[PDB]
Amino acid sequence: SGFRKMAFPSGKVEGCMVQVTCGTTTLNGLWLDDVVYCPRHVICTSEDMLNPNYEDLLIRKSNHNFLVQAGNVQLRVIGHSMQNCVLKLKVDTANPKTPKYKFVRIQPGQTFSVLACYNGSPSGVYQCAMRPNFTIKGSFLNGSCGSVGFNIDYDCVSFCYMHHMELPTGVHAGTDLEGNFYGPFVDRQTAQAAGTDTTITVNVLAWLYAAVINGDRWFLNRFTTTLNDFNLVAMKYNYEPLTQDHVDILGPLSAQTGIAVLDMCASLKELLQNGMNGRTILGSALLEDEFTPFDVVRQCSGVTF
Amino acid sequence: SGFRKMAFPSGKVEGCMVQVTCGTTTLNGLWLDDVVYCPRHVICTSEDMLNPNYEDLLIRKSNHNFLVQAGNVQLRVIGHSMQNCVLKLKVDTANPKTPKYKFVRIQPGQTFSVLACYNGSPSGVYQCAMRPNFTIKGSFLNGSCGSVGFNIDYDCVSFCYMHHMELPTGVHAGTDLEGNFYGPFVDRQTAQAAGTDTTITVNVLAWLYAAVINGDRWFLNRFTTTLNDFNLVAMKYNYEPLTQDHVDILGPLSAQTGIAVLDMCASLKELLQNGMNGRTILGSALLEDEFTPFDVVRQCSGVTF
Ligand SMILES: CNC(=O)C1(N2C[C@@H](C(=O)Nc3cncc4ccccc34)c3cc(Cl)ccc3C2=O)CC1
Ligand SMILES: CNC(=O)C1(N2C[C@@H](C(=O)Nc3cncc4ccccc34)c3cc(Cl)ccc3C2=O)CC1
Ligand SMILES: [Cl-]
């Protein structure tokens, strides 16, 4: 029993965190094999960050301009290149702690673990989701840039996020490990705002199924709904549209609990129109949307890494 | 900006998790130096569990009765002893991944990270607090026994909890790393129940101070309160009594925000009276009590918004 927001064990990722310094800027880097990946804005001064021509800033730099530190050992940069918004620093030594890895681009609604670092030192780990507006409601301070998001499959670490900036509403923006941003954001000190957010419907439903598994059935009713009728109600409460793919994905949870997906949708329809009425689901007074159907199944089965 | 429930990086602990088998029972063990620590109920059957004589069960065991597995390597047990509710198995190999560590006993309200394991394999990490009733609202399944709670402060891993059992209300009970239980519990399958739980007042206050640091003041009022008058109201809402020690501990947060502890106590008195009225504090519709005053200073910035 018990349902907590759970992150993946961060050990495989901790052994990859290095500190990258270019002039006055200091942020985090991911050391995989003989390459260190970090945000390209490390070459930017507070003057440059306004309208930076990154190719022009990088062409002036030499390898010795980049100081890379792994624990207490200094790494020797022997080459540098740029891929989108990420800077790739070819180092002299291959990381002996390099795990089995992949660079994957995650979709909105999909969750991941974040290893928050400052000066190449992991300070904390937390789980979070890629919002439909492409921001992440993370927990970062100055120096957190270059912190990474990841998932674990078996022994394979799937890198999906690198931190770049904080938006004026306190939410966060970053890129996949190939330097391509998530969302309509650019790596510049300019006026940027997150788009209006929506609730991840398939994740709320999965979290309602998780509550049924933990013996919370007060919200269940005798009613069902059509997929079209549920989406008309959901669109009115700023919920993401539920697709047939979402219904199919909730199949195993529906089979395990005995509550059809459209039956569980009629319970969510009632929670949206009437509220909780002083009640909680899994100790929460709000409908939680940062647990995917796979996260629920993994936490209610005991999958190890 | 941003305030998340954050666990410590689990890497230093992952390198200590081993699988311990005695007959038919299989649970987790903590391998530090040449000793593996695990719940003593690994020598028990489900028949023994009602009224087990552990000294009588252990005297009938030899070293080769205990199978210890570290990854894919088998460890050779060369000695065994019992310290309270923990079984200490002396092994032939010292753990090369042994971090700097300490065994610390915590008090209710103290938080810690849990590395949930099954068959000596870490499956997840989550943050949680020692409840005033000495239970932990964890997330554990069968086989999780021997999973550990810890805090990594600076370069030292402070082991504070080892998982032993789940109570009928779904909450969890365990011991410190010296085998002494937290609470009035025994490692017996007997009719035992958790005492009535209470809210950790000093932690809720710290979390209100964290919200003020992140630029939220909607809950503050022009009132102050005496310590006794606040406790009379707090007891009525099942909140732990706030002591002078608690007030002193909130000193740095009170100094940083400019809101005296008894002024923040008056805001809490009003919050319990009025509820939130559709509003949230740090993205929560409930008053959070699993962040200590120390956690808030560690996670939040030194400059208030
Ligand atoms: C809110 N930050 C700022 O005002 C500043 N900023 C710095 C940086 C950025 O956002 N860093 C952060 C990232 N995560 C959490 C932060 C918390 C607190 C301060 C900074 C944080 C950044 C990067 C890029 Cl690609 C584009 C623009 C900026 C940028 O504007 C400082 C000027
Ligand atoms: C909930 N408990 C049980 O179903 C049973 N049980 C077994 C065991 C125990 O609690 N194991 C678990 C530990 N953490 C999470 C569990 C979740 C689900 C099942 C088991 C779990 C145990 C150990 C000790 Cl020292 C004292 C009592 C028990 C005990 O009562 C089987 C009866
Ligand atoms: Cl303590």
Q: Which numbered ligand comes closest to the C-alpha of B165?
A: 2
Same domain for A2 and A37?
no
Whether A121 and chain B come into contact, CB under 8 Å, resolves to no
Compute the radius of gyration of chain B from its Cα atoms: 22
Same domain for A178 and A284?
no
Tell which B residues from 32 to 91 touch A, by Cβ distance under 8 Å. none
**Closest atom of ligand 2 to CA, residue B172:** 14
Same domain for B206 and B296?
yes
Domain end among A149, A168, A197 = A197
Same domain for B209 and B256?
yes
| Pairing, β B156-166 against β B100-103 | parallel
Same domain for A1 and A29?
no
- Secondary structure of residue A87 in the 3-state scheme: strand
Cβ of residue B142 lying under 6 Å from some atom of ligand 2: yes
Give the CATH number of the domain where residue A50 resides: 2.40.10.10
Q: Are the C-beta atoms of residues A233 and A266 closer than 8 Å to each other?
A: no
Beta-carbon contacts of residue A49 (< 8 Å; ≥ 6 apart): A41, A188, A189
Ligand 1 pocket residues where CB is under 6 Å: A 41, 49, 140-142, 144-145, 164-166, 172, 187-189; B 1
Backbone angles phi, psi at B233, to 5 degrees: -75, -45
Domain end among B99, B114, B145 = B99
The answer to whether the CB atoms of B118 and A302 lie below 8 A apart is yes
- Secondary structure of residue A23 in the 3-state scheme: coil
Q: Are the C-beta atoms of residues B86 and B37 closer than 8 Å to each other?
A: yes
Cα separation of B177 and A201, whole Å? 42
HEC letters along chain B: CCCCCCECCCHHHHCCEEEEEECCEEEEEEEECCEEEEEHHHHCCCCHHHCCCHHHHHHCCCHHHEEEEECCEEECEEEEEEECCEEEEEECCCCCCCCEEEECCCCCCCEEEEEEEECCEEEEEEEEECCCCCCECCCCCCCCCCCEEEEEECCEEEEEEEEEEECCCCCEEEECCCCCECCCCCCCCCCCCCCCCCECHHHHHHHHHHHHHCCCCCCCCCCCCCHHHHHHHHHHCCECCCCHHHHHHCHHHHHHHCCCHHHHHHHHHHHHHHCCCCCCECCECCCCCCCCHHHHHHHCCCCCC
Q: Are the C-beta atoms of residues B185 and B173 closer than 8 Å to each other?
A: yes
Cβ of residue B166 lying under 6 Å from some atom of ligand 2: yes
Token duo for residue A147: 């912190």
Burial of A249 (0-12, 13-18, 19+ CB in 10 A): middle
Q: Which of A28, A26, A8 is nearest to A18 (CA)?
A: A28
Same domain for A189 and A111?
yes
Structure resolution, Å: 2.2
Same domain for B183 and B262?
no
Q: Give the domain extent around A231.
A: 198-301
Total domains present in chain A: 3
Cα separation of A242 and A234, whole Å? 8
Domain end among A180, A197, A214 = A197
Q: Which of B190, B284, B281, B266 is nearest to B222 (CA)?
A: B266
Q: How far is A142 from chain B (nearest CA, A)?
A: 9
Ligand 1: which of A165, A171, A172, A181 to mutate, judged by most atoms within 8 Å of the beta carbon? Answer: A165
Would residue A41 show up in a list of annotated catalytic residues for this protein?
yes
Whether A170 and chain B come into contact, CB under 8 Å, resolves to yes
Cα separation of A204 and A187, whole Å? 32
Distance from the alpha carbon of residue B133 to the mean position of ligand 3, in angstroms = 15
Same domain for A208 and A285?
yes
The size of chain A, in residues, is 305
Same domain for A192 and A202?
no
Cβ of residue B291 lying under 6 Å from some atom of ligand 2: no
Same domain for B28 and B4?
no
Same domain for B78 and B22?
yes
Same domain for B62 and B130?
no
Order of strands across the sheet that contains B86-91: B73-75, B66-70, B17-22, B25-32, B35-39, B86-91, B77-83
Report CA A251 to chain centroid distance, whole Å.
25
